[PDB]
Ligand binder design. Structure first.
Ligand SMILES: *[C@@H]1O[C@H](CO)[C@@H](O[C@@H]2O[C@H](CO)[C@@H](O[C@@H]3O[C@H](CO)[C@@H](O)[C@H](O)[C@@H]3O)[C@H](O)[C@H]2NC(C)=O)[C@H](O)[C@H]1NC(C)=O
Ligand SMILES: OC[C@H]1O[C@@H](O[C@H]2[C@@H](O)[C@@H](CO)O[C@@H](O[C@@H]3[C@@H](O)[C@H](O)O[C@H](CO)[C@@H]3O)[C@@H]2O)[C@H](O)[C@@H](O)[C@H]1O
Ligand SMILES: *[C@@H]1O[C@H](CO)[C@@H](O)[C@H](O)[C@H]1NC(C)=O
Ligand SMILES: *[C@@H]1O[C@H](CO)[C@@H](O)[C@H](O)[C@H]1NC(C)=O
Ligand SMILES: OC[C@H]1O[C@@H](O)[C@H](O)[C@@H](O)[C@H]1O
Ligand SMILES: [Ca+2]
Length: 428
């Protein structure tokens, strides 16, 4: 049944908001382990490397925290611990965790290591350092599938200007040699997945918390040469408002796992997971608002839903129709909220709880929100991130309770702040 619904608030088996940002994924046997920053405290300072497990990548269960602060050290609560990655060391039968270990102004620019014999740990800190003497901020660990299972650190170096790939020693404890450097790449948030014997690097450019168009690069060796940057998503959408975290191989394709960073409320940062489809020979995000993964078969199924054009709705109050090449049908409804509404009618449904995808444009740099009322019911307030332009449409999901047969859905009523411009909705 379960569904990967990007943008919705995800909850563990305990009903608590998952707090595993900067995802790192490890698969011991039939269990998946998801590692991330715990951001419960709405701050970038360190609180925990969390630990969640699952058997099918949707139903997650929060274990003990795999790494926890230590006062007077550099994994203390005055420091920063980002993007935990974990591979398994066959030789030592040992789980080695890498992370970006830094100071609160990111001037320290180090890696940190920790080990444990249990996948979810807890892990003991072995210390932090500059890899081969150089800056390391955003990083990732690639485990090759050669016989030695050689591991590589991927990291943004020299104040994020030069992207580097270096080989890990046979213990995964330190870096033995450089392999590759892209000078002036200003790449961060890296991941690598190996597909058809070719290495694909995925990475953001550097733009603070602001999402930018993430890029793919390929090479037949980790040393290179690497292809020039290409898009994994439509450029205007800024990776569908997200930033790469982990790229997990899945059958003959992969899953793109990104974070939607909310700097002003970091705990509430969302998880953006999409099929990464290689049918063209290269990774492309499949913009699936709702989709399912069958891990055992390495397949994904993209749920198909029904589109309703916001402009075919019934406007109320001071809402308007707007025109733009970014809108589906060429139109959207503006001036929603602050006295303007639109009701979408004859939304057909077998009844129950249905994921509905609100397609909108938000030209501001800050969040808006919209009220959503089904058949005159009490409204839920749905968040609307900055979209990248009044002509750029991304989508957020809201789970709604419909009746069998004909429903209505009302946007913008009972809110004094303007909402974002509604392009359409897709009822799954
Ligand atoms: C729903 O979206 C609206 C905007 O679309 C959000 O309203 C904005 O809300 C913020 C925070 O509540 C307001 O901020 C503050 O303004 C006061 C003085 O006005 C200032 O002293 C504070 O430092 C802060 O900046 C902001 O005025 C408001 N802007 C607009 C245009 O409405 C609202 O917060 C969202 N609601 C939810 C539940 O997320
Ligand atoms: O804001 C913190 C947050 O955002 C990301 O990245 C930023 C930081 O890693 C930061 C560290 O100094 O560097 C940003 O990059 C600029 C660089 O692009 C510019 O040209 O020069 C300055 C030199 O001071 C700086 O290096 C980067 O955007 C991370 O993705 C996220 O995890 C978190 O750290
Ligand atoms: C976990 O989610 C999966 C959906 O694929 C399913 O087994 C069920 O809904 C959940 N199981 C439990 C025990 O909560
Ligand atoms: C790795 O080597 C660095 C030198 O850059 C050193 O500072 C650090 O302590 C070493 N750590 C381990 C675990 O070998
Ligand atoms: O500020 C009020 C207006 O702002 C515009 O940017 C938006 O496209 C309109 O639909 C309306 O919301
Ligand atoms: Ca439209």
């Amino acid at each position: 049944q379960n569904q990967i619904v990007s943008g919705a608030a995800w909850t563990d088996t305990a009903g608590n908001t998952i707090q595993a940002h900067g995802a790192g994924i490890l698969q011991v046997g039939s269990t998946f382990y998801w590692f991330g920053e715990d951001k419960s405290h709405n701050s970038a300072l360190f609180k925990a490397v969390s630990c969640y497990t699952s058997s099918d990548l949707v139903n997650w269960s929060r274990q003990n925290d795999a790494l926890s602060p230590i006062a007077g050290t550099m994994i203390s609560t005055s420091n920063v611990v980002e993007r935990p990655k974990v591979i398994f060391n066959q030789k030592n039968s040992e789980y080695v965790m890498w992370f970006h270990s830094d100071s609160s102004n990111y001037g320290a620019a180090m890696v940190g290591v920790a080990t444990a014999k249990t996948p979810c740990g807890p892990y003991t800190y072995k210390g932090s350092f500059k890899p081969l003497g150089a800056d390391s901020r955003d990083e990732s660990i690639f485990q090759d599938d050669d016989s030695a299972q050689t591991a590589y650190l991927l990291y943004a170096s020299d104040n994020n200007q030069n992207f580097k790939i270096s080989r890990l020693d046979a213990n995964y404890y330190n870096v033995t040699a450089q392999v590759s450097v892209m000078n002036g790449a200003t790449l961060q948030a890296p991941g690598i997945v190996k597909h058809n014997g070719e290495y694909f690097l995925i990475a953001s450019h550097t733009s603070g918390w602001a999402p930018n168009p993430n890029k793919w690069f390929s090479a037949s060796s980790l040393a290179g040469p690497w292809s020039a940057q290409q898009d994994i998503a439509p450029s205007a959408t800024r990776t569908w408002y997200s930033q790469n975290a982990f790229d997990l191989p899945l059958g003959s394709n992969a899953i793109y796992m990104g974070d939607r960073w909310r700097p002003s409320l970091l705990g509430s940062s969302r998880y953006i997971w999409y099929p990464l489809d290689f049918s063209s020979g290269a990774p492309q995000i499949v913009h699936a608002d709702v989709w399912s993964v069958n891990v055992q078969a390495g397949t994904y199924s993209v749920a198909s839903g029904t589109s309703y054009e916001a402009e075919n709705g019934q406007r109320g109050g001071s809402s308007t129709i707007l025109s733009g090449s970014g809108f589906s049908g060429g139109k959207a409804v503006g001036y929603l909220g602050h006295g303007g509404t639109v009701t979408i009618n004859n939304v057909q449904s077998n009844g129950g709880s249905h994921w509905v995808a609100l397609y909108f444009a938000n030209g501001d740099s800050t969040y808006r929100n919209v009220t959503v009322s089904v058949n005159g019911g009490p409204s839920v307030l749905v968040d609307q991130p900055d979209s990248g332009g009044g002509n750029v449409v991304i989508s957020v999901p809201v789970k709604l309770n419909l009746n069998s047969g004909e429903n209505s859905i009302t946007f913008g009523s009972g809110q004094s702040n303007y909402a974002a411009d509604l392009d359409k909705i897709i009822v799954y």
